[PDB]
Amino acid sequence: GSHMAKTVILDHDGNKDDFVAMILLLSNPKKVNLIGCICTDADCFVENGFDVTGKIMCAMHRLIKTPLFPIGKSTATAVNAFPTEWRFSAKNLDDMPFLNIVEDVALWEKLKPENEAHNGQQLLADLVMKSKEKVTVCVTGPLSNMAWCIEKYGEAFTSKVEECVIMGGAVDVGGNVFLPTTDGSAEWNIYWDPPAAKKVLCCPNIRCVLFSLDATNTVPVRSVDVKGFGAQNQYLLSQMVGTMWAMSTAYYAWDALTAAYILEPTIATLEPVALDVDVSKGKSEGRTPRAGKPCVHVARNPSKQMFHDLVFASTRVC
Amino acid sequence: GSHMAKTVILDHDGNKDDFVAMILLLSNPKKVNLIGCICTDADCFVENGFDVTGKIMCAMHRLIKTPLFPIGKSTATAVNAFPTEWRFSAKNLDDMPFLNIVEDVALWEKLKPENEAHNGQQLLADLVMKSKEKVTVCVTGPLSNMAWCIEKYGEAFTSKVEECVIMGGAVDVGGNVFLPTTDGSAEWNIYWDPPAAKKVLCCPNIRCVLFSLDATNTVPVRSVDVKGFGAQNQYLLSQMVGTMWAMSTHEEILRDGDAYYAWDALTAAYILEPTIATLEPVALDVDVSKGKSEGRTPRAGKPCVHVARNPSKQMFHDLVFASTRVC
Numbered sequence: 096g097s098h099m100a101k102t103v104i105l106d107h108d109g110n111k112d113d114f115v116a117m118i119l120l121l122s123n124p125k126k127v128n129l130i131g132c133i134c135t136d137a138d139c140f141v142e143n144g145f146d147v148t149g150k151i152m153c154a155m156h157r158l159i160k161t162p163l164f165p166i167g168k169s170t171a172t173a174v175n176a177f178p179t180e181w182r183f184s185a186k187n188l189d190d191m192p193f194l195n196i197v198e199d200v201a202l203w204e205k206l207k208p209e210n211e212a213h214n215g216q217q218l219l220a221d222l223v224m225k226s227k228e229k230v231t232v233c234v235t236g237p238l239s240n241m242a243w244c245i246e247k248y249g250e251a252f253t254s255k256v257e258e259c260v261i262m263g264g265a266v267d268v269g270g271n272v273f274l275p276t277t278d279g280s281a282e283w284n285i286y287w288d289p290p291a292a293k294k295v296l297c298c299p300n301i302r303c304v305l306f307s308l309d310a311t312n313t314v315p316v317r318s319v320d321v322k323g324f325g326a327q328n329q330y331l332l333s334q335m336v337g338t339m340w341a342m343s344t345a346y347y348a349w350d351a352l353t354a355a356y357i358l359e360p361t362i363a364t365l366e367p368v369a370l371d372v373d374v375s376k377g378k379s380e381g382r383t384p385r386a387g388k389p390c391v392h393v394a395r396n397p398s399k400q401m402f403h404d405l406v407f408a409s410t411r412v413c
Numbered sequence: 414g415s416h417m418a419k420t421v422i423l424d425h426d427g428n429k430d431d432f433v434a435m436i437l438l439l440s441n442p443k444k445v446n447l448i449g450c451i452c453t454d455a456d457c458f459v460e461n462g463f464d465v466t467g468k469i470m471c472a473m474h475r476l477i478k479t480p481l482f483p484i485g486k487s488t489a490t491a492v493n494a495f496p497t498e499w500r501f502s503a504k505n506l507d508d509m510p511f512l513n514i515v516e517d518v519a520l521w522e523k524l525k526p527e528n529e530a531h532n533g534q535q536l537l538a539d540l541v542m543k544s545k546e547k548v549t550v551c552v553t554g555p556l557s558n559m560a561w562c563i564e565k566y567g568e569a570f571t572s573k574v575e576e577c578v579i580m581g582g583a584v585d586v587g588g589n590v591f592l593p594t595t596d597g598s599a600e601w602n603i604y605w606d607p608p609a610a611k612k613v614l615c616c617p618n619i620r621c622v623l624f625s626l627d628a629t630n631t632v633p634v635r636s637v638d639v640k641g642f643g644a645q646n647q648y649l650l651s652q653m654v655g656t657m658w659a660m661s662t663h664e665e666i667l668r669d670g671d672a673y674y675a676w677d678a679l680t681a682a683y684i685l686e687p688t689i690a691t692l693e694p695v696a697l698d699v700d701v702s703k704g705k706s707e708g709r710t711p712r713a714g715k716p717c718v719h720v721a722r723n724p725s726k727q728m729f730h731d732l733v734f735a736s737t738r739v740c
């Protein structure tokens with residue numbers, strides 16, 4: 096009732112917050128058994144996302160003996176691509192000193208070829224279907240990999256999912272996709288691939304917990320807080336997350352909060368809502384307005400203090 | 414004949430490379446006695462640049478007992494302001510973990526108020542004029558502070574300057590100021606204040622060594638190199654420079670060959686190793702017009718500056734990595 100770690104897969108798109116989320120999960124083996132990561136060419140260049148995912152894995156394995164796990168690059172392609180400016184952040188992280196410690200680089204170069212052979216969508220399907228226990232899939236990128244799995248395998252996949260904890264959408268607040276051709280109502284992870292979002296969010300065979308902008312707007316990354324990691328600079332994870340956050344000091348802790356829920360389910364209350372995902376090519380493309388028969392459990396009023404305490408504790412692990 | 418240290422002041426504008434330059438100088442006390450820093454509100458927000466300068470000073474002082482020194486915010490104002498996107502980098506650095514170690518933050522808070530009372534221009538004039546030995550001023554921001562000192566004090570100031578080693582200009586290559594109102598021939602530190610550059614660069618009373626884009630184009634900040642700092646991650650100065658560089662390695666790809674270069678770091682490296690580049694005497698005709706060529710430093714004649722040529726990539730590399738193993 097404690098002593099059994101949730102079995103988890105992180106399905107992410109390699110920006111700074113995706114990696115803070117990965118650190119939260121992987122640094123808490125008591126609560127989380129991370130059996131796999133998928134990386135999608137969305138808010139990153141996938142090769143950089145792949146390398147950074149690899150090196151973080153290796154670093155934690157060295158320091159706290161968390162298991163190694165398979166990592167796969169998804170071949171999903173954008174309906175609507177992220178701005179290039181944003182996508183470079185995983186390149187920067189790849190070059191960071193904390194991600195080039197010689198032992199980690201040596202292990203990753205050894206492990207990289209086997210992982211290079213994986214297809215990400217197929218890996219997500221295989222990890223979930225072979226798992227002994229039901230799996231919690233943490234989706235911090237677009238929903239394309241989940242959608243592919245559901246379409247290809249149906250019940251054989253969805254029956255093995257405990258729940259899907261998703262960062263995406265904006266229900267009662269504005270979105271964050273501000274383009275000449277959009278109205279500002281949509282959120283980027285949905286907008287990257289709306290039909291995939293529509294297939295997963297309102298899939299009747301799966302429990303979705305949704306961290307939409309409604310909740311994530313509540314946890315901006317701010318200097319006053321980020322400065323706190325200096326007191327912890329001896330810990331590699333504090334160097335990692337302090338730097339990720341300092342490069343960002345808004346930028347919100349979007350994906351990190353989503354992973355925090357898996358660690359502490361009381362962090363937010365949940366509201367069942369039926370959503371009508373806009374898959375049109377109009378200016379409201381990607382919107383997730385209230386539709387009815389509930390699609391998702393929307394996170395509400397996340398605890399800033401609980402979040403804060405969890406991030407700072409986790410970054411003292413090593 | 415080789416065993417002495419040069420007295421140096423760093424006059425900078427607080428972007429990432431300005432701080433690598435500062436680390437190079439301050440980490441080499443055998444070669445350099447850093448007696449002061451000036452920070453200008455150019456390629457940074459000055460309050461951030463001030464704080465980062467402070468915390469780097471304190472960190473070195475803790476680790477290797479380099480002296481503390483006065484720091485002053487210049488009140489110089491732009492003729493042409495820097496893009497805001499670029500000026501945030503010192504805010505990011507101010508929030509980094511390697512610049513919030515509790516002992517360093519405590520010392521800086523104690524030292525800040527005395528330093529806050531300085532005027533940057535006046536401090537530059539005072540440090541140079543009181544110094545026992547002639548001073549090398551390393552200028553890695555705009556030339557506004559040097560210009561002010563020359564104009565206010567003349568030879569009382571300039572007679573005390575050993576030489577002025579400057580990052581700025583583009584002589585035989587294109588510039589880096591790309592605006593709807595400019596032609597691309599100008600470099601940003603000149604462009605920020607062209608009359609100040611014209612006053613200092615062709616001041617007949619001072620030796621200027623110029624690291625213009627000609628030389629700096631040769632040292633782009635590249636992933637394959639920056640990854641090297643990981644082998645040195647136990648050293649705080651490797652964390653610092655590795656991060657500053659790793660925040661910068663994407664620009665070459667994003668901007669189609671227009672890299673983030675080690676501009677100011679190479680300029681400081683010259684002070685540490687004068688053989689890193691050869692020098693060519695050139696007369697320059699600084700364009701102070703309001704046309705699209707504003708800030709250009711074309712060849713004019715009676716030499717203004719000694720322009721750095723063909724810097725040694727390997728020497729630079731070896732100097733950066735050794736300096737970052739100091740602590």
Ligand SMILES: OC[C@@H]1[C@@H](O)[C@@H](O)CN1Cc1csc2c(O)ncnc12
Pocket residue numbers: 110111112113138181235236262271282283284345346349350
């Ligand atoms: O919409 C939030 C999702 C989260 O999964 C983050 O990884 C960023 N991602 C896209 C995104 C929206 S604004 C924004 C930004 O400003 N910079 C980088 N990425 C983003």
Ligand SMILES: OC[C@@H]1[C@@H](O)[C@@H](O)CN1Cc1csc2c(O)ncnc12
Pocket residue numbers: 428429430431456499553554580589600601602664672673676677
């Ligand atoms: O012209 C080079 C001088 C050097 O002193 C650097 O500090 C940046 N600075 C301005 C500058 C030019 S391009 C560029 C850039 O791309 N990012 C930030 N700063 C700059």
Ligand SMILES: [Ca+2]
Pocket residue numbers: 107108109110112113138235236350
């Ligand atoms: Ca993401």
Ligand SMILES: [Ca+2]
Pocket residue numbers: 425426427428430431456553554677
């Ligand atoms: Ca500068």
Ligand code: NI
Pocket residue numbers: 096097098099
């Ligand atoms: Ni138990």
Ligand code: NI
Pocket residue numbers: 156
């Ligand atoms: Ni092992």
Ligand code: NI
Pocket residue numbers: 165209210213
């Ligand atoms: Ni495999």
Ligand code: NI
Pocket residue numbers: 276277376377378380
């Ligand atoms: Ni459109």
Ligand code: NI
Pocket residue numbers: 323407
């Ligand atoms: Ni705290």
Ligand code: NI
Pocket residue numbers: 414415416417
């Ligand atoms: Ni000597």
Ligand code: NI
Pocket residue numbers: 474
């Ligand atoms: Ni002391």
Ligand code: NI
Pocket residue numbers: 483527528531
């Ligand atoms: Ni004073």
Ligand code: NI
Pocket residue numbers: 497
């Ligand atoms: Ni603004």
Ligand code: NI
Pocket residue numbers: none
């Ligand atoms: Ni190699």
Ligand code: NI
Pocket residue numbers: 666667668669
């Ligand atoms: Ni391009």
